Amino acid sequence: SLEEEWAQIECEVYGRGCPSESFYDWFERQL
Amino acid sequence: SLEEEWAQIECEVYGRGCPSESFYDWFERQL
Amino acid sequence: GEVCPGMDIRNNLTRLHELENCSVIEGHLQILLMFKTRPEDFRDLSFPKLIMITDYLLLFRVYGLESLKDLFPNLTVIRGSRLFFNYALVIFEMVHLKELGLYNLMNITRGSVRIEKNNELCYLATIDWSRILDSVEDNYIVLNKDNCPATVVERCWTHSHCQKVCPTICKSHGCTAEGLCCHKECLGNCSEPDDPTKCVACRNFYLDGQCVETCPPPYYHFQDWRCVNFSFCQDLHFKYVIHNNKCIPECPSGYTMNSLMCTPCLGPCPKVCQILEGEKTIDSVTSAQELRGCTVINGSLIINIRGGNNLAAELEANLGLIEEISGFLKIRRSYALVSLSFFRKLHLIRGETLEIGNYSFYALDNQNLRQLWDWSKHNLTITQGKLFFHYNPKLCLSEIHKMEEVSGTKGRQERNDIAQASCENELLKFSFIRTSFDKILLRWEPYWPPDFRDLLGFMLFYKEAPYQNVVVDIDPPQRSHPGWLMRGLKPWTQYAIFVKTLVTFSDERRTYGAKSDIIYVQTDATNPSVPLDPISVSNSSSQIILKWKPPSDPNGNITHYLVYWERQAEDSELFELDYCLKGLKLPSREEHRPFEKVVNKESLVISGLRHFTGYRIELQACNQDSPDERCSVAAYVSARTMPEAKADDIVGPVTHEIFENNVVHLMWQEPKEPNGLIVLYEVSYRRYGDEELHLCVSRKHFALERGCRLRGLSPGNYSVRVRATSLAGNGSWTEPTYFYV
Amino acid sequence: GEVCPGMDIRNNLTRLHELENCSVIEGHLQILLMFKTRPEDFRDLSFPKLIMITDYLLLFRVYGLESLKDLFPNLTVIRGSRLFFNYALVIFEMVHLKELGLYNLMNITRGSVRIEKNNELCYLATIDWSRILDSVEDNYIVLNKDNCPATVVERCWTHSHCQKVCPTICKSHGCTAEGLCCHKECLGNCSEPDDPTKCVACRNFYLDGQCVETCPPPYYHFQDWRCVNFSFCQDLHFKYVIHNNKCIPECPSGYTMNSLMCTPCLGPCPKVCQILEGEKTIDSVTSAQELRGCTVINGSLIINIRGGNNLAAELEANLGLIEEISGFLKIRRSYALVSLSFFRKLHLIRGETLEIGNYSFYALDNQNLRQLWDWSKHNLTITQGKLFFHYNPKLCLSEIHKMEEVSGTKGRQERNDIAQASCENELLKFSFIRTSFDKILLRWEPYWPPDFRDLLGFMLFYKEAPYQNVVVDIDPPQRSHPGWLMRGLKPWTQYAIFVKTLVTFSDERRTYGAKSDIIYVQTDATNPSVPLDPISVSNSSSQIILKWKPPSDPNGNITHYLVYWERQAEDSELFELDYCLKGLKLPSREEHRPFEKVVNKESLVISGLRHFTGYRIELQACNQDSPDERCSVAAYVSARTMPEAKADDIVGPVTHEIFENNVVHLMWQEPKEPNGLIVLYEVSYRRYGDEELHLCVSRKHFALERGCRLRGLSPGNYSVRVRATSLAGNGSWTEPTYFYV
């Protein structure tokens, strides 16, 4: 549909945030 | 009522005209 | 005699002396306000030459006068072309008048007579106005002192003059002293009877000393009373037009001055509107209302509305009809004005009159003027003068250059002639558009000014535009393609969308930003609305006509109507209920089903249906045919066929069995195909010499007894007749079965 | 041992050496990203002093390490005060680790354990985390290489160290080598059993080398694990607060810093919001969102929103909560801004930081700023600095003078400090007001500027104002009192009206015109709405309770409810219909009338009503009592009383007459006061030795035969019992009449 794509682009360019920096993400934050 | 008074004041101050200059009125127009 | 215009004589009697040579007054004559005149001033004051007055005669506040028999002895006809409040004769407040004395008046073609508040006035009840005027019900003659022929009492005006009455055969043409009728074209009177050249007045028209019913060409009717050549009308035109052989002062509506006959020119009529000293400033709706219908203006226009409310519709309705401007155009201090687009027909500016400093177009203090015209389709022409552009932040050099190129004044403007604002010079494009039945996703390429901090977001404007003849804030993107989604759009609707960026006006040269082009996007279709108002009528025994109205929401281009029908079974309780007793009030009225596709039609016909059989017609609308039709929900309507007129008649031979104890067993064959069902059977049996006796056989009785079984029957010859009672009504009685016991 | 904060050791192992003297880490310890460390670097690297970690422990990308039995031999308790994604122990991607080796850990108070993607890691399935953590369902230990007590298989960690298991009686307090339970305040282990001073860790709190369940006053709990005096918390405050005996870093919501305990201060909490270098410009909603809840600002404010849309509500919601400004205030280039009224709590401006040129208030390029504040009720204080007013046409000298007087900076501004616009200095008054139920007539004294041509009309603004806490164009009057009439007003509604004149800004000193005062006018009342939802219930035999809801449109102050009731007569056809036959399906349910005035009530009670009697209750609402009550139309509801339980019983002695031919005539007395009416009478008669036989007597039969008349009755002893069938149901059978024939 259009809602999921709109949310994805919102988190892609506006950074409202569909992903939350998680247990995993902090590791590649250090790399 | 209020309609007749409103019409009267409209013809009194705005000159839309409740009276039309009649057979009589033209005479005192000349006086 | 000489023809003269109308006079309004007052104060002094000197101006009356101009009437000495006038025989016909082409206008109205008013005589008013002499407070010094005395009867000694009127003893030998006469105007016998005057005969007819075109418009009307008025007498008011005339002191010293006592009778008009001397002043106006020969006044005969009042045409009444122009009426004073629907009066052709006004005699108001005559203090000293004693009698009318007008012994030559005989017809008033148009208007009424009002004689009011005239003291000392007599000889009024003796005047017969019915023979003068066609209708006298409008005569207002009140509050006065009030040999000769007698009409329904003698008619007289003076002690010496009787009221002349002409024979009915003479009509209004007049008659001489001998009573002979005048000529058919004569009006008033005639020196010689039956002579058009001797008529004192003309009934229809006057020409060359003669009375005629119409003015032959090239002569045209003038003032509805005479005939004049084209030369006279032309001379009158140069300080008048020709239309339908009439020298009317001005052409009628919908006509233009064809250089001297009026010619149709559709709505816009080319007219030269002369401004007071060629200068007028427009600042209000009523100021523009004075320019209604103007097309060519003989002056200069200055536009300055100190309002504050959007009155563009009124200005466009009033203005915009002018094609050429003789003078210069100025716009100054317009607050509520946003654009000059309402100048619909403004194309050429002659600029004969120029603003000081050799300027034809002046522009100053424009606080909201962002656009001049749609230069894509609107063309403007400037003959002379220089352009002016100062203190107009909302209008930038792009529009100025465009209008200079359109007008053709490139090499005509010098230095200083041309000096928060939506002036996006750069262009934006849309990168990705996705549509749904109610949702739209837009994506455009990112825009970055040299100072990205000046960017403050985006503005998206959307509106439903059925025709191509043409408010959301979007956060700035983080430092790829920004986009937006909207969900409040009706299906199958076209919307106009254009995106405007938001930039900061810095101290230095402000980056004007980029504007995106307007686009029209149509929403995707969906399932249409329900087709309501379904009416199904059994116009015949087995014919059903179904009519319906198109659904309120088409939600696309409606492809067809899907119709289903199914036989409706009657209630089972009717097959078990007994009606022979009192109270005979009869109430009168996945799976694949036979379906129809109504295409390019609004009605349907159904055949091959059983009589008196209910059907549940189901209707839906579909805006799709091959790919999984999007159809609305079912609409249900009940249709009942008219029953047969013969299905209620009992058929088959009626059989009877006689027992030893005079017990009768009756067998009859029911109409196996009845009008729905048979509630009961009615039997009427009567012996010779007796009265008819009634009996009822119920469905249960008919089933159990296979008919009827009468017991205890007296000897004699009986008659058996059975009627089947169905829903359609009473049936036909059986043949009379006669048996002797 | 020494207490230390948390460390995040990476790259090099030098920063690890700071742990040599730390026994308790007041924080979390992270060990990550060593790509050069080798097993030869960890052979004798040990930190036996460390025991407990408050927050969590993390190991990531640790190369060369093989076991923690040497590095962290004595680590015992992980409190888990702060958790890494709800994990108190993170062991991620250990390439070279072969075993955990942490043979002293026994409890994890809060958090979970995540051991993932650690290759070569063994001795994991032999670890029992259930005795360590209260809940182990959240443990995520996946994708690894995976004498001693045995639990539901033996539990072990190394080839030489078994998994210590304490008896259940010891709970989480630990046990020694002999198995004896430690002290109740001991956590982890104890050198001497049953000794609070010998606990290696404290279950609740640690103070003075002892374990306690709470910190006694004046000691306050710190980090939920120890107890500290007020002096330590105060020292921490000066680069911490006190609340509920807790040295929390910051006060909770709804509390203010009471110079060192938090004190409730209602909604507005006095807080010092420190701006980056004391300077911040507000230009967007998100920019103002950073100032949410601020009351005292330690800096200067510059306001410049380059928007274009009315965002006053958002700005007022975010801002307006600040009471004092340390620095200066500047407003510049605000387009969409119209007023500063949204500064709700802005009262004092300290002006410690001033704009260049000794200015505290700066105002520039205000294109729509017409009003500053409601100076009638809003007070402003300015300590230092000079006012600035330039290029602000919408704000005139009246507002500037008012704000200067309010602030108290009269003798503080020099020359050049202060330099289409609604600035009506003069005042207007209303001359005559007339009100109707929906129409209002307004009249004001005429106003004439020195140049009457500058006048262009009037603007009338009307809006419905229920509370006094606060677009029509009128043509210019001709050259006494101008007036207007409006008809679109709801009855009994208050509207706020103020009239603004329209004047032209001329080249010379423009006449500012006159503004009329705001007034509140209430529309006249009328007939109220219909009271809908009328429910009438017979809660008793003769009691009716009526309930209704107040009308939707009161149209004034509702004075009372007018109620009428009338007896409802039953259908006459029931008195002529016969029901003895089959189909016994019984359907079970000017003039002055008795009226009631319901005052200050919403329900009514009606008594003295006959049983099973219908009534047509009529309800209206009236907002008037004495002067010709204005009442709405009638609202009708049907109410039926419950019938009596005894009215259906037949009373009176049953009489029988015996004829010569065994013909019986039965006389019975009907219940003259029945439950409405009796449809029929049911009779059951049975001779001895026979079965009961049923009979029906209709109303027509009862009337004609005065009862019943049975014919052809066999000899014997009969029993007669009659039941009256009414609408309420079957009645009571009569007494058994016994007669012998």
Is residue C115 within a helix (H) or strand (E), and if so which, with residue range?
A: strand C112-116
Q: Where are any strands of DSSP class E within D523-667?
A: 535-537, 544-547, 560-564, 567-568, 595-598, 603-606, 614-622, 635-640, 655-658, 664-667
* Partner chains of C (3+ C-beta pairs under 8 Å): A, B, D
Whole-number Å distance between alpha carbons of C413 and D262: 74
Whole-number Å distance between alpha carbons of D663 and D711: 5
Inter-CA distances, D405 with C129, C340, C572, D245, D327, Å: 85, 45, 94, 49, 21
Whole-number Å distance between alpha carbons of D666 and D668: 7
Q: Do A2 and C485 touch (CB under 8 A)?
A: yes
User: What's the gap in Å between the CA of D479 and the closest CA on chain B?
Assistant: 9
Whole-number Å distance between alpha carbons of D25 and D33: 21
Is residue D318 within a helix (H) or strand (E), and if so which, with residue range?
A: helix D312-318
The DSSP line for D388-447 is -BBS-TTS-HHHHHHHHHHHT-GGG--TTSB-------EEE-EEEEEE-SS-EEEEE---
Q: For D66-85, give one letter per residue: b (16+ CB within 10 A) or e.
A: bbbbbbbbbbbbbbbbebbe
Of C221, C206, C207, nearest in space to C230 by CA: C221
* C436 residue type, one letter: S
- Tokens coding C316: 């466009």
Residue of C456, C473, C582 with shortest CB distance to D581: C582
Cβ-contact D516, D499 below 8 angstroms: yes
Whole-number Å distance between alpha carbons of D157 and D124: 8
Cβ-contact D369, D395 below 8 angstroms: yes
Whole-number Å distance between alpha carbons of C406 and C106: 70
Omega into D264 within 30° of 0, i.e. cis?
Answer: no
Q: Tokens 């009670």 belong to which residue? A: D605
User: What's the gap in Å between the CA of D637 and the closest CA on chain A?
Assistant: 52
Inter-CA distances, C303 with A12, C273, C329, C346, C389, Å: 52, 17, 8, 14, 15
Whole-number Å distance between alpha carbons of C638 and C537: 9
Give the 3-state secondary structure of residue D700: helix
Q: Do D87 and A23 touch (CB under 8 A)?
A: yes
Q: Do C85 and B23 touch (CB under 8 A)?
A: yes
* ∠ CA C563-C564-C566, rounded to 5°: 155
Of D129, D180, D128, nearest in space to D154 by CA: D128
Whole-number Å distance between alpha carbons of C588 and D323: 84
Is residue D231 within a helix (H) or strand (E), and if so which, with residue range?
A: helix D230-237
Inter-CA distances, D552 with C741, D522, D527, D529, D561, Å: 82, 19, 12, 6, 14
Inter-CA distances, D213 with C461, D200, D204, D344, Å: 65, 15, 5, 48
Distance in angstroms between the alpha carbons of the first and the last residue of chain B: 35
Contacts of D505 in chain C (CB under 8 A): 306, 333
- Tokens coding D285: 């909603």
The DSSP line for C577-607 is ---SSS------------EEEE-S-SEEEE-
Cβ-contact C305, C283 below 8 angstroms: yes
Give the 3-state secondary structure of residue C698: strand
The DSSP line for D581-609 is SS------------EEEE-S-SEEEE-S-
Is residue D521 within a helix (H) or strand (E), and if so which, with residue range?
A: strand D519-522
User: What's the gap in Å between the CA of D433 and the closest CA on chain B?
Assistant: 11
Contacts of D115 in chain A (CB under 8 A): none
Residue of C306, C456, C504 with shortest CB distance to D505: C306
Q: Which residues are C720's β-sheet partners?
A: C685, C737
User: What's the gap in Å between the CA of A14 and the closest CA on chain D?
Assistant: 13
Residue of A2, A13, A15 with shortest CB distance to C434: A2
User: What's the gap in Å between the CA of B1 and the closest CA on chain C?
Assistant: 31
For C308, the closest chain D residue by CA position comes to D420
Pairing assessment for the beta strands C514-516 and C472-474 based on DSSP bridges: unpaired
For A16, the closest chain C residue by CA position comes to C478
Give the 3-state secondary structure of residue D68: helix
Give the 3-state secondary structure of residue D641: coil
Chain B residues near any Cβ of chain D (below 8 Å): 1-3, 5-6, 9, 12-15
Whole-number Å distance between alpha carbons of C221 and C214: 8
Give the 3-state secondary structure of residue D72: coil
Q: Give the Cβ contact number of residue D440 at 10 Å.
A: 22
Contacts of C478 in chain A (CB under 8 A): 13-15
Cβ-contact C722, C696 below 8 angstroms: no
For residue D516, how far is the Cα from the chain centroid? 42
Half-sphere exposure at residue C215, Cβ-oriented, CA atoms within 13 angstroms? 23
Contacts of C443 in chain A (CB under 8 A): 9
Cβ partners under 8 Å of residue D254, min gap 6: D264, D265, D266, D267, D269
Count of residues in chain B: 31
Rama region for C64: left / alpha / beta (φ>0; ψ in -120 to 50; rest): left
The DSSP line for D81-127 is SS-SSSEEEEEE--SS-------S--EESS-EEEEES-TT--S-TT-
Pairing assessment for the beta strands C272-282 and C296-303 based on DSSP bridges: parallel
Contacts of B27 in chain C (CB under 8 A): 60, 92-93
Rama region for C465: left / alpha / beta (φ>0; ψ in -120 to 50; rest): beta
Q: Do A13 and C480 touch (CB under 8 A)?
A: yes
Which one of B27, B29, B31 would you mutate to disrupt binding with C, by most C Cβ within 10 Å of its Cβ? B27
Q: Tokens 């006012």 belong to which residue? A: D387
Q: C and A: touch, per 3+ CB pairs < 8 A?
A: yes
Whole-number Å distance between alpha carbons of B8 and B29: 21
Specify burial of residue C718 (Cβ count, 10 A radius: 0-12, 13-18, 19+): buried
For B30, the closest chain C residue by CA position comes to C33
Of C475, C134, C339, nearest in space to A14 by CA: C475
Cβ-contact D168, D181 below 8 angstroms: no
Cβ-contact D319, D325 below 8 angstroms: no
Cβ partners under 8 Å of residue D497, min gap 6: D440, D442, D460, D461, D462, D518, D519, D520, D521
Q: Which residues are D228's β-sheet partners?
A: D220
Whole-number Å distance between alpha carbons of C234 and C394: 53
For A27, the closest chain D residue by CA position comes to D60
Give the 3-state secondary structure of residue C352: coil
Contacts of A31 in chain D (CB under 8 A): 33
Q: Which residues are D32's β-sheet partners?
A: D10, D60
The DSSP line for C282-337 is E-SHHHHHTTTT--EEEEEEEE-----S--HHHHHHHSS---EESS-EEEES-SS-
Whole-number Å distance between alpha carbons of C516 and C444: 9
Q: Give the Cβ contact number of residue C8 at 10 Å.
A: 14
Resolution in A: 5.4
CATH fold for the domain made of D272-407: 24 nucleotide stem-loop, u2 snrnp hairpin iv. U2 a'; Chain A (3.80.20)
Which H, E and C letters describe D319-384, residue by residue?
CCCCCEECCCEEEECCCCCCECCCCCCCCEECCCCCECCCEEEEEECCCCCCECCCCCCCCCEECC
What percent helix, strand, coil does chain C show, rounded to 5? Answer: 10, 35, 55
Give the torsion sign (CA, D346, D351, D355, D358): positive
Q: Do B23 and C60 touch (CB under 8 A)?
A: no
* ∠ CA C279-C280-C285, rounded to 5°: 170
Cβ partners under 8 Å of residue D729, min gap 6: D648
Show the domain range for A5: 1-31
Give the 3-state secondary structure of residue D684: strand
Half-sphere exposure at residue D372, Cβ-oriented, CA atoms within 13 angstroms? 26
Omega into C218 within 30° of 0, i.e. cis?
Answer: yes
Inter-CA distances, D162 with D84, D126, D128, D166, Å: 29, 10, 12, 12
Cβ-contact C657, C709 below 8 angstroms: no
* C729 residue type, one letter: G
Whole-number Å distance between alpha carbons of D11 and D19: 16
DSSP one-letter code for D4: E
Cβ-contact D265, D321 below 8 angstroms: no
Of D722, D724, D715, D735, nearest in space to D658 by CA: D715
Specify burial of residue C626 (Cβ count, 10 A radius: 0-12, 13-18, 19+): exposed
Residue of B5, B6, B14 with shortest CB distance to D478: B14
Rama region for D416: left / alpha / beta (φ>0; ψ in -120 to 50; rest): left
Residue of A6, A13, A14 with shortest CB distance to C485: A6
Of C662, C665, C703, nearest in space to C683 by CA: C665
User: In degrees to the nearest 10, what's the CA dihedral of C79, C81, C87, C90?
Assistant: -60
Half-sphere exposure at residue C6, Cβ-oriented, CA atoms within 13 angstroms? 17
- Tokens coding C645: 């007129």
Cβ-contact D283, D311 below 8 angstroms: no
* D259 residue type, one letter: S
Whole-number Å distance between alpha carbons of C57 and C138: 17
For residue C266, how far is the Cα from the chain centroid? 19
Q: Which residues are C698's β-sheet partners?
A: C680
Domain count, chain A: 1
Whole-number Å distance between alpha carbons of C315 and D521: 35
Pairing assessment for the beta strands C614-622 and C567-568 based on DSSP bridges: antiparallel
Residue of C443, C478, C485 with shortest CB distance to A14: C478
For C336, the closest chain D residue by CA position comes to D420
Pairing assessment for the beta strands C348-349 and C324-325 based on DSSP bridges: parallel
DSSP one-letter code for C181: B
* ∠ CA C378-C380-C382, rounded to 5°: 175
Cβ-contact C182, C189 below 8 angstroms: yes
Of D199, D221, D222, nearest in space to D211 by CA: D199
Q: Which residues are D462's β-sheet partners?
A: D497
Whole-number Å distance between alpha carbons of C394 and D335: 14
Pick the CATH number of C205-264 from 2.10.220.10, 2.120.10.30, 3.60.15.10, 3.40.50.280: 2.10.220.10
Whole-number Å distance between alpha carbons of C47 and C53: 13
Q: How many helices (H) and strands (E) does chain D have?
A: 6, 51
For D420, the closest chain C residue by CA position comes to C335
Residue of C441, C477, C481 with shortest CB distance to A6: C441
Inter-CA distances, C271 with C238, C265, C268, C293, Å: 16, 11, 9, 8
D244 touches chain C (CB under 8 A): no
Whole-number Å distance between alpha carbons of C622 and C557: 9
D473 touches chain C (CB under 8 A): yes
Cβ-contact C512, A29 below 8 angstroms: no
Cβ-contact C503, C495 below 8 angstroms: no
**Dmax over Cα atoms in chain C, in whole Å?**
139
Whole-number Å distance between alpha carbons of D207 and D222: 10
Based on its alpha-carbon atoms, the radius of gyration of chain A, rounded to whole angstroms, reads: 12
Cβ partners under 8 Å of residue D71, min gap 6: D42, D45, D46, D47, D65
Whole-number Å distance between alpha carbons of D589 and D569: 13
For residue C547, how far is the Cα from the chain centroid? 31
- Tokens coding D67: 């076991």
Q: Do C502 and D307 touch (CB under 8 A)?
A: yes
Cβ-contact D644, D674 below 8 angstroms: no
